[PDB]
C-alpha cells in the first residue's frame, strides 16, 4: 500500500457481473479448445444461445477449511460437474430446480445442452498463514473403473489443474472445453444416466494449512468458487414440468 486507496485493482467484467482481482492468476486448460462442428449433426432444431444469461459469472460455494483438519489430500470439494453447480439450488426436500437462477433458466425448458466452463477459485488469507491447494478436473471421472484411486493429490498433479498458494494468495482459473461421449448432455432424468455429468471437480489440500500458535490468529480460511458457461447451446424445447429432477447421488 503506497496510495491513499491501497493499490490498483484489476477488473474482469462479464455480462452484469464484475470481479475484482489483485494478483496474478494461475491458469490451465483441460484440453485443446475448438469450435464444435459435428454437434449440428445431432439435432435438426436450431440451437438457442443465451449469451446475456449464461456468459455471466456465478458464485457457487464457499467451503471452509481449518488448521486442525488439513491432511495431505483432504478433499474440500469433490463434485460431479457441472451437475453440482447447475443443481446447486435445492428446495426443502433437496430436490434441485432450474427455475430460480438466471444462468440456469434455460436448463429448465430444454432437453439437451452443450457448453464450455471456466471455474475460478478465490482464497483471501492474511499474510502470515501458509498453505497450498490444488483444484483439478477429470473428464467423466465418476464412470472410471478405479475412480477412487485417482483422488490422491499425487494423481491430481497429472490431470489439468491449477495451484493456489496461500502465502501469495493468488487467483486460479481452470478452463474446461466441452468434451463428452456424445455431442450433448441431458438436462434432466429422462428416457429410463444422470443429468449434466461431464466430469468431477476436485479441490485437495496439497500442503496442509498452517498458522501461528497465537490464540487470536484465524484457525480457518474460506475458499470460494465461481463458474461460467461459454459457448452454451440448448436444444429440444419442452415443457418445464414434462420431466422431473430427483435428489442427486453423491460421490464416495
Amino acid at each position: 500500500m503506497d496510495r491513499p486507496e491501497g493499490s490498483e485493482e484489476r477488473t474482469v467484467q462479464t455480462s452484469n457481473v464484475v470481479l475484482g482481482e489483485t494478483n496474478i492468476e494461475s491458469q490451465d486448460i483441460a484440453s485443446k479448445e475448438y469450435s464444435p462442428t459435428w454437434d449440428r449433426l445431432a439435432s435438426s432444431e436450431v440451437s438457442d444461445e443465451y449469451p446475456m444469461l449464461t456468459d455471466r459469472w456465478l458464485f457457487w460455494k464457499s467451503v471452509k477449511w481449518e488448521v486442525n483438519d488439513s491432511a495431505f489430500g483432504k478433499m474440500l470439494v469433490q463434485e460431479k460437474f457441472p451437475q453440482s453447480w447447475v443443481q446447486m439450488d435445492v428446495n426443502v426436500n433437496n430436490i434441485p430446480r432450474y427455475t430460480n437462477i438466471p444462468n440456469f433458466i434455460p436448463f429448465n425448458i430444454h432437453q439437451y445442452m452443450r457448453a464450455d466452463f471456466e471455474v475460478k477459485i478465490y482464497v483471501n488469507p492474511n499474510d502470515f498463514v501458509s498453505g497450498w491447494l490444488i483444484m483439478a478436473f477429470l473428464y467423466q471421472g465418476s464412470e472410471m473403473f478405479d475412480y477412487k484411486l485417482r483422488r490422491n493429490p499425487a494423481a491430481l498433479m497429472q490431470m489439468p489443474h491449477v495451484l493456489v498458494n496461500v502465502g501469495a494468495a493468488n487467483e486460479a482459473t481452470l478452463k474446461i472445453p466441452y468434451r463428452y461421449v456424445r455431442p450433448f448432455m441431458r438436462c434432466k432424468d429422462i428416457l429410463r444416466t444422470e443429468p449434466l455429468n461431464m466430469g468431477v471437480l476436485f479441490v485437495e489440500v496439497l500442503i496442509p494449512f498452517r498458522t501461528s500458535a497465537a490464540s487470536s490468529a484465524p484457525k480457518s480460511l474460506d475458499v470460494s468458487l465461481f463458474v461460467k458457461m461459454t459457448n452454451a447451446k440448448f436444444t429440444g424445447m419442452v415443457d418445464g414440468s414434462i420431466a422431473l429432477l430427483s435428489k442427486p447421488i453423491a460421490l464416495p
Partner: protein, 54 residues
C-alpha cells in the same frame, strides 16, 4: 404419384444436416440394399449319412 405423395406438409423445423449416408462419421456409405445383399448369408445346412445315399 400416390405412393410418395405428400399433401399439406407442415414442418416445424429445418431438415437435419447430412452425413453422406454415414460416410462422415464412419468410413463407408450405406446408401443401398444391393450392397447389403452381397454380404454372404447361410442358404441350406444339412447332414448326409451313408444309407440314405445311393
Amino acid at each position: 404419384m400416390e405412393r410418395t405423395f405428400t399433401p399439406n406438409v407442415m414442418q416445424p423445423t429445418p431438415l437435419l444436416p447430412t452425413t453422406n449416408d454415414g460416410r462422415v462419421t464412419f468410413g463407408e456409405a450405406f446408401n443401398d440394399l444391393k450392397d447389403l445383399a452381397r454380404r454372404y448369408q447361410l442358404y441350406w445346412e444339412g447332414t448326409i449319412l451313408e444309407g440314405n445315399l445311393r
